[PDB]
Every structure is written in structure tokens, then in C-alpha cells.
Design a binder for these strands. Structure first.
Lengths: 137, 141, 191, 61, 75, 141, 49
RNA sequence: UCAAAGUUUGAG
RNA sequence: AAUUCCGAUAACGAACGAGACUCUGGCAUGCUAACUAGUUACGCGACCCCCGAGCGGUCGGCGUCCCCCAACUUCUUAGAGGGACAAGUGGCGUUCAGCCACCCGAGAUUGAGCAAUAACAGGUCUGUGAUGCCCUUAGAUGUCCGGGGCUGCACGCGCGCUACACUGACUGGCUCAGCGUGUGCCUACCCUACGCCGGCAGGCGCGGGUAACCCGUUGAACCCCAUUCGUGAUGGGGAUCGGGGAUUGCAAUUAUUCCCCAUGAACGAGGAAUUCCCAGUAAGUGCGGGUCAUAAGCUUGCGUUGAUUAAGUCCCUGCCCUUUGUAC
């Protein structure tokens, strides 16, 4: 049923309305089938709906939970950026914000010329895996 | 007509429903958020899963008594994709099996037996056996 | 049920084989045709033991193929039953009769053995054993189905049914029946 | 013209790699007639080959 | 060659096609529906579940992996 | 005086121990009817003997069965054996040896496995390969 | 027997074909017209039976 | 009832 | 299968191997057997609550609660015997050695272990308080402490795992193994039930176990049964990396392992080439042992699910005998 959206634009990313909603959201950077399913279950949604249904109030309602997980009892654990060094915050990042956090960490260590930083800088395997044989590109 | 006599799949369904209709189990606050084991990629689809697990738990206890949490994990066990390394057993969630057992304790479906663990309790034995009768009188099929 | 066994459902009796040669190596009724196409059945003792195995079980076993589906017999039995259930809907008549008819007209009647011939490989064409024709037919068509059913939204069972139908019929549309006519034709081309 | 041919006597397994059984056959239509020919797969004394040709009759290979 | 773009909808002309055509096949599996129409697969399955509850198609078998249906049951 | 006959069937490492008894025809296994057991595609299997003989023969003969060990499919194949052996045992010892032979014939002509066991069993692995006959890959160059 | 069934002549003897092939040693030895032999056997000049 | 198939540490 | 036999015979009679042998597997309602097996069917002596059917009796179901002054040994364990020998019938065979078939019943054939002569300048002096020679021997090539390294990455190869999805994926549910192993130690520690705490990794309490006694009816996986998904690099795949959290440790940074969220690469079955394998085998599938404070993508064992194809030949690759040629 429901003849409306089909394609959807949220948080600078797109989303397939033609996809099912838990598995549609995940197309945003910083939300995975876990966190999506949670974010929807807090929102109280017929998650058997496609995203090409779902009233625009509802997609706003989801987004708000998604951005503000701790206000809606999405607990500690379910958060990609916990106790994040730059300030004492524990939260979930989303979209290009995530990517910017990432770059600020690899910057941070590059600035510290840390062993990990350097191996990022050099474009190596960083989590001390062997490299004689593998990751050849 | 006891419960052993019945198709156990379609039993736990009516048991859970029974446990839903009563409406005094004690589903915790996590439920929504929690995974259900280290096995699982995801949480359950059936949102009212707790009712289902309790049932399966009680219906096991009808079958094998004296079964603690540890017991419950090993039963609620299975495969553990470790991705690119090969697979193993993983023990189910301790807490969900503890909470289920404490929830059936509060119902007085179950009771902690001597020699440790839980055995399902007389008043409980009633209920499971009662719904077995229900299912057997569903139809000739 | 005590005097006559069905196959769960299907009629064993009134399944007529036509080719007096597959006859005896198609095992669909001596009298002995069974309920299930499972059976511990050690028909890999002696050379021809295999032939007295029932053809449905033979097919069942073959189905069970490629890595994943190794020793997954139930998995494959379920298939065979569904294909049969589909055949009875689509075609009607006994799906056993249709399966049989496939086997008959699907495996080759002649084939090209690789003889050495000096060094550069040039074959001569020969006849094929009746058991060889059933083996082929069985695996050809079973493979045909499976090869169809990869990346398409179609049940194994369904494709298995469609193959068995288009093999039973001289369709030039089954992977097998097409494969059969290739062989024979090559076989002719160095007779 | 297709003909069926009953197998009277397996002679011996020929073929290069050990394959094609050299096989003596009665001719089903008229049992008096009898070829020897080579066959793939397991054959045995008494069964029926479907020969497409029926005028070829191999010997050594 | 192979690229297929399936529907996920209660989309008028198809919906007519289901309710007219589909109950005069002898095999009514969602796989058979998905091929005939350009209908998803999940969509098909549910549609064929609607038609069953309406009564327009017979149930053959309803197994984990594959559901079979039929023509009305004429006479 | 009671007509009790404990008999067993076997497959791989499953011991199905049927127990025929002067009763009123139950035939139920571990503790539930044959209609379950529950690999279920293999149901007809563990009905076969009953279908092949008919309820006439089993009629006044109650059969409790116990299984352990082996796998699912084996276990079935054990009980399959077990009861049809046990019946044959029952008839021998209490009914009459003309009847036993009549039955035994009607079981065999269907399948020899219903009475006689598969001596087959899992063949031992030798080093230098993952299994018995298979070896690990040789490299050469 | 194919021929003698499709003969015009009642009975008929059927003729023969007389050929004195000569072979050079190599050619004999190759097409197996003659093997090699042991030091004893070499001497014994009876034809094969 | 015969396609092609050349070579081999100085380092004991 | 066998230089295994029959037989021929300037040979005769012997020796090793081979076979016999050992372990193993499969047959024993026959024997000996049991509270560290089962109990086993009983008795139901019961409990037990409506536990159920049922007006009530009589049944169905187990949990168990049971001891011993019940009754055994079908299942269990493991001893000692038995048991098949091509013995029987029919073929084929000098009507010898044997081969084929079939009956009864495992059909000579379950699978390992051991395993000749003479070699190889195979490997090992880094297993040894086996050892010649040589070297060093206090500013050490002895030893110990700290630190690093053996993990370094334009690259090439070998065993491997995981994949490429729909015969699938997830999510619930149902449901069956076998070999083992285990603290109280040769130098410091095991296996773990049960109960609480934590989403989880784990934490904290009490118990049993030198073990058929406890872990442990080892309640394994795949499989089965419903879920959704729907041929889209898609929820197939899970590499890469960010953030946090647990434990092992004297210490884990070059991520010891473990959990969580997030990230989401190649890969749509693989050129030429080649590996392994014929019956409960391959393959799938899990679980033990080994190492092991921490611990398996390896291996060494175990079972569970369980095929296709052969039953043959010397084409290739090789081997064993005969004769032959040889300038090796």
C-alpha cells in the first residue's frame, strides 16, 4: 500500500524508500542493522513497512532518535563514539560528521607521530598484522 | 493428554500467548535493545520474544528438571560465525536465561529445586499440561 | 497401504516404461517401489547393485550436489517431493511416470569414447550401456535444474519439475535433452 | 533406422584407457544376426543396446 | 544482459492482473508470480497470501522454503 | 504372567531399545507418539513396519521405545529396526512360529534393514589427511 | 554369411587371395611379424604353430 | 597397420 | 595381493620377507557380571498436585523419592569362549592350485600396526650428561638482566580458512553424538555444576570431581521446523579501520586473546596448470586431544549428515618380473 515517497533524502545521504526501513536507514554512515533496528524500535514503528511509506513526521521522529540516542534510552554500548577524548561525551555520530571524527583521530596521532599514526601515514597495515605476504595493492 | 504427546513447536506458541494473556511475567527494560547472545548478528524479529523464550524455558523444565542458567545457555546455543575464521559453538545469553527463570519464579511456574537449578513447579505443571490439552483439542490434523 | 505402497501420494502402478532397455535399469516397480526416496541402502557394494536402487532415490542422491549440498539428503528429498507436487499440478498424471519418461528420453543413446589414435586425439563413437544412459540422464537433468536455479528467484524444486517435464517431453529446452542431442550428434560426427 | 540388440556375450574390455567393452550382440528383430561392438558404461551378459547405425561392427581398438 | 528492476507496490494495473489472471495458472508459487509480473518476491508472496484468505486460490503446500498454490478448484 | 519382550535396533551408534508388551497398541518412542519423533521427512520410515504389517498385528501389543546416541536419522533407523524386530520377537516367544515367519517375510521383501543391522560404522582417520582415505594436498614444485 | 545369404549362386565356394609379402627386418620387427628372442631360442628355426 | 620429444657442475 | 600356491626341474634341503601375528570393527536375548552401568520391566511402595484423559474408576506421562530383606542383565561395561574356513550348492579350471556365481549367514576382502636384503654420503651435531675433531673460553661464542627482533614489505611461491549466496541469509523454535580431558603436579596451578551481578566479554558467592562417582541424560553443529528477505556485490561476504569495554599476565604499545557499536574492501565459481579420493569413503558438519598464564585459520583423534562414479587398463605417470640391445 501507500503511494508516496519512494526515494528519500535524509541527513545529507539518500535512502531507498523502496527498501525496508531498518535496512534502508543503514545507508547512512554511522548506523548499522543493530542501531537502526534499535532506533526504529524506540520510535515505535511498523518496521514491516517500506520506507516509501512512513509519514514525514515519522522520518523526522526517527532522525531525532538517531541523532539523540541517549535521550530516548538507546543506552551506553550502542554508540560508536564513547568517551571521545575531545571532550567528555559519549554519543553516536552520523554521516559526514563520522568521517570528520575519523580524520581528526588519524590527524591526532599523525600530529603525535605515534606508531599507529605513522603506519596510517605510510599506508600500511596498522593493527600489527604480518605484511610479507598480504594486502598487496 | 500431557505435553510430551503434542507437537512442541505449536505448543510454545500457545504457551507464550497464554503467558501474554496473563500479563504478569516481568519482561525487563532492555528487551528491545538487547541481542540475545554473542551468536547473533541481530536482535529478534518477534518483538514479544520474551514470552516465547519463557515458554520454551518452562517447556524444557517440564521435560528435563533441575536446570540452572548454565543449563539454559547450553540449550539456547548454536553456531558462531567468526567471519573469516571458522565457526564454533557459543553459549546463549546468561542474563536473559536468568531473567526468564526469575520471571517464571515470580509467576510460580517454577521453583529452585534442591541440588540446584530450577524444576518447573506443580501449579506450573498444571498450566503446560492444560495448554497441551488445548492444542490436542484444536482439531484432528 | 498394506497391499499397495504409494510414494506418500503417488501411484507406483500404471507407470509404463517404453524403451525395452532402460527397462530393468529404471527401478520404479519390479514390484518393489518404496514409500520414501531416502534409505540407508548400500548399493555401492558390488558393480551393478546400484541398478536395483529405486530411480527416485537415485535422483534424490544426485540432486544433493556441489559443496554445500553434500550429505544433505533431507534437504534434497524435500526438493524431490516438491518438484513432484509441482509436476502433478502442471502436467497431471503420475510425476513418477514423467520422471521416468525424462530418464528414457534424456540420456544419450550413443557416445564418443576417447581412444588415443596415434597421439593427436581423434575419437571413435560407440554405443552406451543401458545403465550408463540412466546414470547420464539422472545426473544431466538433475544438474540442468541446479544450474538453472542459481541466481534466479526460482525454487530448486520448481526448476527440477520444469526440467523433468521438458525432458519427459522432447522439448529442446531442458539442459539435459539438449545436451543429449549434442552428444549423439557429435557421436555421429565421428562414427 | 534404429535397432535394439540383445547382448549375448561380453568379450573383453578394450578401449585405450580401459573403457569400451567389446560386446557380442544378438539383434532382437532377427536373433540369427549378430554383431560385435564396443560399449561405454557397465554392460552385462543379457541386456539391450540401442544401436543407431546397425551395419558398422568394430573389431580391434 | 541480466538486470531486473522489481516492484514493491499495490500499483493498479498489476493489482488487476493478479486478481484476474493469477487464479487461472496451475502453479501459483511466488516464484512463478515474480517471473510473470515484475513483482518483487516478498510482494508476490504476500499477494498470494491475500488471495488465499479471499479464497480465490487453493493451498497445496506451505513449506519453509516453498509455497505452492492452485487454480480456484473448478467444476 | 506378562508377555514382555525388550528388543533393540541399531544404526551407526544409536541404540533403539523397543519394548513390546501385552497391551492395546501404542507404539510411542522415548515418550511420545510415532507421528512426531520429528525429523519428520523420515516419518514414513518409522511408520513403514506398522504400515507393512497393519495395525492388526500391533493391535494388542504395546511398544515403548527408548533411544540414545547416534544422530537423528540413525536414531530413527534404529527404532525402525527395533520395533519390527521386537514384534518378530514377541510373536516367536508368545504367539506362534508360523506367524513370526509370515511377518518376517513381509518385512524382508520390503527391506532387509528392518531386522538385520548395518555393520557399517564410521571408519577411522589416519594421519596425513583430514579423514581416512583422503590425503592432504601435495605441493611438488 | 551376409554375402552367402545375398548370393545369386546356390552354394558357391567363395575365392581366396594369395599374397607373398616380403618384409625388411625393421618392418617385420615393428609390425610384430617377428619378435626378438633369447640366445637359446634364436637358434630354433621351426615356424610357429 | 609409426605426428613432436634438444640439452644436462669447472666447482671433486 | 603376494617368490602365494600347483606343477616342472642339476638341483636338495633351509633362512628373511609375504602370509600367520598384534590391535581394531561388525555377530552373539549363550556364559561370567555389577549402588562408580542399566536399573529392567515390574511392584507402582509411592510422592505429587488435578499432573492430565475422564462424572468417577481405569489408563497416558515423566520428574523423580526410593532403599534393600524386589527381579534380572535386552540396552551398559568388559572378561573368557564361540564364530567364517572359500566350509556348502552350481559353473569354469590338467577336473590340481585356484576363479566365478549363489544359499545360509559377516562371504576368502573392516581398517591399522609391525615389516626383508643392499643402499642414500637424505635429514638430524638446535632432543639428549650420545659423540671425534675444530673453534671459543672472562673485554666470552659460558651465563644472567633490560631492551628490541624472529611479526619488519615494490615482490614471487607452498599448505590453509572464508567466501562468492535463495539447495541460501537471518530470526525464533524443535532436536540427536562419539573419542577424550581434568586440580590438590618435577615447581604452581585444573575441570567446572548451582545461585546472584553485568547486554556481553566477564565479575562475585558458595558446591562436586584424582573421576563410569562431579563437570555430564557431555541437551554440538549441520540437519529438521516456522521467519523475513528477494537476485540487487542484496540482509551474500566480512577484509580494512575508528571508538569504547572485559579478562591472561611482571608487562600486550607493532593492535595477546575476548565482547560491543560503527566501518563495509576484493570476490558474481576462477587462465594455463594441477591435488586428493571408490563405502559409512569424498564432501559437509561440529566436538575432543596436542601446544596452552594467555590460545587455533595447524595438526592429531572423535563422531554426526552422507553422495556421484569404478570394479577396468596400461594411454600418461610410475613400479615388479622375462627375453633383448647397450660405446652407460
Amino acid at each position: 500500500p501507500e503511494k508516496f515517497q519512494h526515494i528519500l533524502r535524509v541527513l545529507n545521504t539518500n535512502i531507498d524508500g523502496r527498501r525496508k526501513i531498518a535496512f534502508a536507514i543503514t545507508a547512512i554512515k554511522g548506523v548499522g542493522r543493530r542501531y537502526a533496528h534499535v532506533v526504529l524500535r524506540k520510535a515505535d514503528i511498523d518496521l514491516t513497512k517500506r520506507a516509501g511509506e512512513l509519514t514525514e513526521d515519522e522520518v523526522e521522529r526517527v532522525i531525532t532518535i538517531m541523532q539523540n540516542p541517549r535521550q530516548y534510552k538507546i543506552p551506553d554500548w550502542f554508540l560508536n563514539r564513547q568517551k571521545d577524548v575531545k571532550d567528555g561525551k559519549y554519543s553516536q555520530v552520523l554521516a559526514n560528521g563520522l568521517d570528520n571524527k575519523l580524520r581528526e583521530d588519524l590527524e591526532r596521532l599523525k600530529k603525535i607521530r605515534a606508531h599507529r599514526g605513522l603506519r596510517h601515514f605510510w599506508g600500511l597495515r596498522v593493527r600489527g598484522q604480518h605484511t610479507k605476504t598480504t594486502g598487496r595493492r | 493428554v500431557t505435553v510430551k504427546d503434542v507437537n512442541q513447536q505449536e505448543f510454545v506458541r500457545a504457551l507464550a500467548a497464554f503467558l501474554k494473556k496473563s500479563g504478569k511475567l516481568k519482561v525487563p527494560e532492555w528487551v528491545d535493545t538487547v541481542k540475545l547472545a554473542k551468536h547473533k548478528e541481530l536482535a529478534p524479529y518477534d518483538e514479544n520474544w520474551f514470552y516465547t523464550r519463557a515458554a520454551s524455558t518452562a517447556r524444557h523444565l517440564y521435560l528435563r528438571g533441575g536446570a540452572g542458567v548454565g543449563s539454559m545457555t547450553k540449550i539456547y546455543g548454536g553456531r558462531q560465525r567468526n567471519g573469516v575464521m571458522p565457526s564454533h559453538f557459543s553459549r546463549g545469553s546468561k542474563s536473559v536465561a536468568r531473567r526468564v527463570l526469575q520471571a517464571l519464579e515470580g509467576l510460580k511456574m517454577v521453583e529452585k529445586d534442591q541440588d540446584g537449578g530450577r524444576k518447573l513447579t506443580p501449579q506450573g505443571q498444571r498450566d503446560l499440561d492444560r495448554i497441551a490439552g488445548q492444542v490436542a483439542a484444536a482439531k484432528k490434523k | 497401504t498394506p497391499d499397495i505402497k504409494l510414494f506418500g501420494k503417488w501411484s507406483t502402478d500404471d507407470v509404463q516404461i517404453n524403451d525395452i532397455s532402460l527397462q530393468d535399469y529404471i527401478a520404479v516397480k519390479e514390484k518393489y517401489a518404496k514409500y520414501l526416496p531416502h534409505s540407508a541402502g548400500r548399493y555401492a557394494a558390488k558393480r551393478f547393485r546400484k541398478a536395483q536402487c529405486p530411480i527416485v532415490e537415485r535422483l534424490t542422491n544426485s540432486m544433493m550436489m556441489h559443496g554445500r549440498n553434500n550429505g544433505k539428503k533431507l534437504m534434497t528429498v524435500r526438493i524431490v517431493k516438491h518438484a513432484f507436487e509441482i509436476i502433478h499440478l502442471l502436467t497431471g498424471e503420475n510425476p513418477l511416470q514423467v520422471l521416468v519418461n525424462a530418464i528414457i528420453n534424456s540420456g544419450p543413446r550413443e557416445d564418443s569414447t576417447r581412444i588415443g589414435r596415434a597421439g593427436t586425439v581423434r575419437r571413435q563413437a560407440v554405443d552406451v550401456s543401458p545403465l550408463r544412459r540412466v546414470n547420464q540422464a539422472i545426473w544431466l537433468l538433475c544438474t540442468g535444474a541446479r544450474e538453472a536455479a542459481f541466481r534466479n528467484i526460482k525454487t530448486i524444486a520448481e526448476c527440477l519439475a520444469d526440467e523433468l517435464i521438458n525432458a519427459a517431453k522432447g522439448s529442446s529446452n531442458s539442459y539435459a535433452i539438449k545436451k543429449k542431442d549434442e552428444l549423439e550428434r557429435v557421436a555421429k560426427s565421428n562414427r | 533406422p534404429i535397432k535394439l540388440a540383445r547382448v549375448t556375450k561380453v568379450i573383453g574390455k578394450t578401449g585405450s584407457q580401459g573403457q569400451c567393452t567389446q560386446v557380442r550382440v544378438e539383434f532382437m528383430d532377427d536373433t540369427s544376426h549378430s554383431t560385435i561392438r564396443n560399449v561405454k558404461g557397465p554392460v552385462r551378459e543379457g541386456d539391450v543396446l540401442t544401436l543407431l547405425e546397425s551395419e558398422r561392427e568394430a573389431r580391434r581398438l | 544482459r541480466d538486470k531486473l528492476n522489481n516492484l514493491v507496490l499495490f500499483d493498479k494495473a498489476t493489482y488487476d492482473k493478479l486478481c484476474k489472471e493469477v487464479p487461472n495458472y496451475k502453479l501459483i508459487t511466488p516464484a512463478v508470480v515474480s517471473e510473470r509480473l515484475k513483482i518483487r518476491g516478498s510482494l508476490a508472496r504476500a499477494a498470494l497470501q491475500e488471495l488465499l484468505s479471499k479464497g480465490l486460490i487453493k493451498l497445496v503446500s506451505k513449506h519453509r522454503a516453498q509455497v505452492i498454490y492452485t487454480r480456484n478448484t473448478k467444476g | 504372567p506378562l508377555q514382555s519382550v525388550q528388543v533393540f535396533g541399531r544404526k551407526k551408534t544409536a541404540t533403539a531399545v523397543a519394548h513390546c508388551k501385552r497391551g492395546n497398541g501404542l507404539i510411542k518412542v522415548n515418550g511420545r507418539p510415532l507421528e512426531m519423533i520429528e525429523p519428520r521427512t523420515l516419518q514414513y520410515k518409522l511408520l513403514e513396519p506398522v504400515l507393512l504389517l497393519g495395525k492388526e498385528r500391533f493391535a494388542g501389543v504395546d511398544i515403548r521405545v527408548r533411544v540414545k546416541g547416534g544422530g537423528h536419522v540413525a536414531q530413527i533407523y534404529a527404532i525402525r529396526q527395533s520395533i519390527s524386530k521386537a514384534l518378530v520377537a514377541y510373536y516367536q516367544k508368545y504367539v506362534d512360529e508360523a506367524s513370526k515367519k509370515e511377518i518376517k517375510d513381509i518385512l524382508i521383501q520390503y527391506d532387509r534393514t528392518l531386522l538385520v543391522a548395518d555393520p557399517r560404522r564410521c571408519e577411522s582417520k589416519k594421519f596425513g589427511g583430514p579423514g581416512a582415505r583422503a590425503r592432504y594436498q601435495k605441493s611438488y614444485r | 554369411r551376409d554375402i552367402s545369404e545375398a548370393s545369386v549362386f546356390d552354394a558357391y565356394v567363395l575365392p581366396k587371395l594369395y599374397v607373398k609379402l616380403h618384409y625388411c627386418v625393421s618392418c617385420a620387427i615393428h609390425s610384430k611379424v617377428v619378435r626378438n628372442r633369447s640366445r637359446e631360442a634364436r637358434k630354433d628355426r621351426t615356424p610357429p604353430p
